[PDB]
Amino acid sequence: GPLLLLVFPHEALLEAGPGGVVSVHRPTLEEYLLHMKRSATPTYPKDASAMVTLLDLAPGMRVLEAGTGSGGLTLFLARAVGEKGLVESYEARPHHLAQAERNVRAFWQVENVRFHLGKLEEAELEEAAYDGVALALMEPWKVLEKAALALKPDRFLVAYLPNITQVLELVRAAEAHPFRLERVLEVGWREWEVRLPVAHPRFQQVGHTAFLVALRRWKG
Amino acid sequence: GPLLLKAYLVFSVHRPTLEEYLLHMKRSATPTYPKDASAMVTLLDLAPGMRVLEAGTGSGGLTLFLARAVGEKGLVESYEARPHHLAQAERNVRAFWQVENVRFHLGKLEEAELEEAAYDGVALALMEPWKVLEKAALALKPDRFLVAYLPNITQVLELVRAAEAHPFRLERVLEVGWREWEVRLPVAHPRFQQVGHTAFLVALRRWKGS
Amino acid sequence: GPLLLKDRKGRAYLVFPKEGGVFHHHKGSVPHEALLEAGPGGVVRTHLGEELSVHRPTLEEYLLHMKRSATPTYPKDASAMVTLLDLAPGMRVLEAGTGSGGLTLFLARAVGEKGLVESYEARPHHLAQAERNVRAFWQVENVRFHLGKLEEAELEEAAYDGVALALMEPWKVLEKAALALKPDRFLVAYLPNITQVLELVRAAEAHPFRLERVLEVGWREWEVRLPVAHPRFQQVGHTAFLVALRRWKGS
Amino acid sequence: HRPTLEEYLLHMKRSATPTYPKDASAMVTLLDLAPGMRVLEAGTGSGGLTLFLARAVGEKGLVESYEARPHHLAQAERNVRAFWQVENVRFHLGKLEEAELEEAAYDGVALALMEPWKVLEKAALALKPDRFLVAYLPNITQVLELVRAAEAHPFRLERVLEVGWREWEVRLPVAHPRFQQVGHTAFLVALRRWKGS
């Protein structure tokens, strides 16, 4: 495993071990995302958590992922389905895919993630074979056809979109597919500074990273 | 498992989302909202295989999340003090989730005993979480987290001060917010009515330690 | 002046002292006299006899308890709009809105008795509401009501220090509002749906405004009854987007 | 290009942490200030809550601003009387606890003080009944200190609230709440004065 202080093994650090001093730590997935090599957005832990919760991902399921880097969203999905549920992650741009496979593979040593280079709409997949579809695309409405195709009825597709304008365009686009609009939310984590006697919500905030969109696949 | 109509649970037809389940199951009493339970799992840094300590009340709402999170290789030990509705936690959890990764107990922790450094994370929903730090701390592998659910900032403060006595560094205090939007074009706005504040989440991290 | 009454449960009521009225909060009447003799600050019993606190209502307190039959405007947002408008006393402000009367009332205070608020309502019911609601709380002359729309209003040119709107389709008045507004003074619009905000911004690029702010006021009430101290569980999450625009220098 | 009060407050000379208009707007609304009223103000920063308060009270109203420490009082006065012509403000070089003021003759008390509890008693006197004291406090721990201390004066706690303005960046086709917000400045505490006691 990798260590946070971010390094990949020098030996005082291992002898101290996590929670020990030389301040050595074993990274949380969160810490790891926030310090890993990025070309990405990056997908934030608060958003990826809520996405796994809307997708209703449980162990053993199949989850379809697109697109971009860098394995941030893919790892959260990877733990959610784990064991051998399956993550089929699609990325279009090849050095971003590369970087992501590296990112994921160094933290997560299980092999429940199948990686695919190429747009999701080019790909061929079974009808009604997937337990959820997670998208982190700037133009998600493109894959809507495939997504309704590959997605078991009464399951969700969950898009991640920064701009509300993109969210509206999905919601209209989604009206021409067997998808019923289930949720539109903004996730927010309100950090507090506690350095007693100082105790206030932090002065500078992550005032949202993105909107999460959730469509449910009704039968059609 | 059970079914959901649009919107009541029973035994438009839907398999219920775990979150839908928590929101329409017999929630004893002031529920664990999924907004929070999801958060806590994230903070606790849970993966498949791990062992997690949970207390207490009282719908086993948090518990299901814990169950899915750690998986089948992992297991959850759930304590709950209260007797009649620890059962109700058990009724709620076995309806939705039929895996052997949860082992229940009656009682508070301090009365209980447990291996030292066995557990990969602790999750508290107790009114007075400061009572269980000697044990929580003992039970916890170093560098892993204790995550505690608390309605009032006064309780958060007390847990922060009581924790200075044990080998815990405070990493985080946060409120979660899932602001739902309504979108029926041309209408598009944040929902008028919202699950505002449910609780603070204190995350503590075990030192080596000493 | 009207009166706000509260019980120990916290529940508040609005009362208008009327000749020999009586207030019923349960199966127990209170004569209006006791309310008036008690005065802002004191208690009254319902002859059964439940303590009840008498208050003069704060402008805010009045807006939330009046019966509100227009699609209406909150104090958190009205407050913010007065401030975005940069409203100082003596100023002249053009207004168009709902029948709430709230927005007109918040603007009325900002400008003072030496200032002015020309308030326009389109529907004649919607006008009566605003007058009813506005002159119960404030009878000063710095508010003048008009029936109609701004695009059809006859306005002096560059005579106004700000424009406050609470219309469902404000792109429509941007043209009149442009000539009516002094350079570097603002238009501020109360829009519930982000779509309306989006259309207005798109529209505004055709008139001599620069967009300046787009925002959402939140007032997070806390409950404190020690040892209970937290953010109120249920709150007024979202009401409206405020859009602030600036009239370009010179034109 | 002439400037709005906000803009002035930004290029103004502010020794302390500034006042944000969200907070000052909310402060005026919570005190229920209308044209004509007589309001009491202290003290840190200087002089931007006072400008808001002058606009609120109006033409015929008056704001009594206390600044314990002089060079600040002066800087308050230059700042205020550069932007705000009206002679509707009265500056005092004194603490607010030490000063001597007619009973039940004020329509509010606006404190930006670190030590708000300290002036609790002289406010209960000065402030008419069923009117308000509103305190700006950054920390929840100070809020709590004040909540305990006011239990010992003729005050009911009406309101504790944090004020947020969620800015949006609209730059079509961009449209999204701004990534970096001013997440929190402070809490507002409103106390109501009881009858006689």
JSON list of C-alpha atoms in Angstrom, two decimals, chain B residues 18 21-22 25-33 37 54-68 76 78-80 82 85-97 102 104 125:
[
{"chain": "B", "resi": 18, "resn": "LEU", "atom": "CA", "xyz": [-31.53, 1.19, 0.86]},
{"chain": "B", "resi": 21, "resn": "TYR", "atom": "CA", "xyz": [-35.84, 1.69, 3.01]},
{"chain": "B", "resi": 22, "resn": "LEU", "atom": "CA", "xyz": [-34.49, 3.88, 5.83]},
{"chain": "B", "resi": 25, "resn": "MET", "atom": "CA", "xyz": [-39.09, 1.48, 7.44]},
{"chain": "B", "resi": 26, "resn": "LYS", "atom": "CA", "xyz": [-40.23, 1.67, 11.10]},
{"chain": "B", "resi": 27, "resn": "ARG", "atom": "CA", "xyz": [-37.72, 4.34, 12.04]},
{"chain": "B", "resi": 28, "resn": "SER", "atom": "CA", "xyz": [-37.04, 4.28, 15.71]},
{"chain": "B", "resi": 29, "resn": "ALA", "atom": "CA", "xyz": [-37.24, 7.07, 16.54]},
{"chain": "B", "resi": 30, "resn": "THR", "atom": "CA", "xyz": [-35.39, 10.02, 15.15]},
{"chain": "B", "resi": 31, "resn": "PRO", "atom": "CA", "xyz": [-33.99, 8.24, 12.09]},
{"chain": "B", "resi": 32, "resn": "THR", "atom": "CA", "xyz": [-30.52, 7.87, 10.78]},
{"chain": "B", "resi": 33, "resn": "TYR", "atom": "CA", "xyz": [-30.90, 9.76, 7.52]},
{"chain": "B", "resi": 37, "resn": "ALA", "atom": "CA", "xyz": [-25.08, 7.19, 7.22]},
{"chain": "B", "resi": 54, "resn": "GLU", "atom": "CA", "xyz": [-21.44, 0.19, 16.08]},
{"chain": "B", "resi": 55, "resn": "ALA", "atom": "CA", "xyz": [-23.59, 1.65, 18.80]},
{"chain": "B", "resi": 56, "resn": "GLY", "atom": "CA", "xyz": [-26.43, 2.24, 19.41]},
{"chain": "B", "resi": 57, "resn": "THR", "atom": "CA", "xyz": [-29.94, 3.35, 18.77]},
{"chain": "B", "resi": 58, "resn": "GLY", "atom": "CA", "xyz": [-32.03, 2.39, 17.22]},
{"chain": "B", "resi": 59, "resn": "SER", "atom": "CA", "xyz": [-33.43, 1.42, 13.84]},
{"chain": "B", "resi": 60, "resn": "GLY", "atom": "CA", "xyz": [-30.30, -0.33, 12.64]},
{"chain": "B", "resi": 61, "resn": "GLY", "atom": "CA", "xyz": [-30.52, 2.19, 9.80]},
{"chain": "B", "resi": 62, "resn": "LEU", "atom": "CA", "xyz": [-26.82, 2.97, 10.08]},
{"chain": "B", "resi": 63, "resn": "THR", "atom": "CA", "xyz": [-26.29, -0.76, 10.42]},
{"chain": "B", "resi": 64, "resn": "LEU", "atom": "CA", "xyz": [-27.38, -1.78, 6.89]},
{"chain": "B", "resi": 65, "resn": "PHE", "atom": "CA", "xyz": [-24.96, 0.81, 5.44]},
{"chain": "B", "resi": 66, "resn": "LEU", "atom": "CA", "xyz": [-22.28, -0.66, 7.59]},
{"chain": "B", "resi": 67, "resn": "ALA", "atom": "CA", "xyz": [-23.25, -4.15, 6.43]},
{"chain": "B", "resi": 68, "resn": "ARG", "atom": "CA", "xyz": [-23.01, -3.31, 2.68]},
{"chain": "B", "resi": 76, "resn": "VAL", "atom": "CA", "xyz": [-20.32, -5.47, 11.92]},
{"chain": "B", "resi": 78, "resn": "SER", "atom": "CA", "xyz": [-23.78, -3.75, 16.59]},
{"chain": "B", "resi": 79, "resn": "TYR", "atom": "CA", "xyz": [-24.51, -2.85, 20.18]},
{"chain": "B", "resi": 80, "resn": "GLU", "atom": "CA", "xyz": [-27.63, -1.13, 21.26]},
{"chain": "B", "resi": 82, "resn": "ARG", "atom": "CA", "xyz": [-32.33, -0.24, 24.56]},
{"chain": "B", "resi": 85, "resn": "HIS", "atom": "CA", "xyz": [-36.20, -1.68, 19.91]},
{"chain": "B", "resi": 86, "resn": "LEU", "atom": "CA", "xyz": [-32.80, -3.33, 19.52]},
{"chain": "B", "resi": 87, "resn": "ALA", "atom": "CA", "xyz": [-35.07, -6.13, 18.36]},
{"chain": "B", "resi": 88, "resn": "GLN", "atom": "CA", "xyz": [-36.70, -3.49, 16.03]},
{"chain": "B", "resi": 89, "resn": "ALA", "atom": "CA", "xyz": [-33.26, -2.75, 14.64]},
{"chain": "B", "resi": 90, "resn": "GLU", "atom": "CA", "xyz": [-32.97, -6.54, 14.07]},
{"chain": "B", "resi": 91, "resn": "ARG", "atom": "CA", "xyz": [-36.45, -6.66, 12.39]},
{"chain": "B", "resi": 92, "resn": "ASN", "atom": "CA", "xyz": [-35.51, -3.77, 10.15]},
{"chain": "B", "resi": 93, "resn": "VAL", "atom": "CA", "xyz": [-32.12, -5.20, 9.10]},
{"chain": "B", "resi": 94, "resn": "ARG", "atom": "CA", "xyz": [-33.11, -8.80, 8.39]},
{"chain": "B", "resi": 95, "resn": "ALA", "atom": "CA", "xyz": [-36.01, -7.65, 6.23]},
{"chain": "B", "resi": 96, "resn": "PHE", "atom": "CA", "xyz": [-33.75, -5.88, 3.76]},
{"chain": "B", "resi": 97, "resn": "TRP", "atom": "CA", "xyz": [-30.40, -7.65, 4.14]},
{"chain": "B", "resi": 102, "resn": "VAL", "atom": "CA", "xyz": [-23.70, -8.54, 11.58]},
{"chain": "B", "resi": 104, "resn": "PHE", "atom": "CA", "xyz": [-25.69, -8.07, 17.67]},
{"chain": "B", "resi": 125, "resn": "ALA", "atom": "CA", "xyz": [-24.90, 7.14, 17.67]}
]
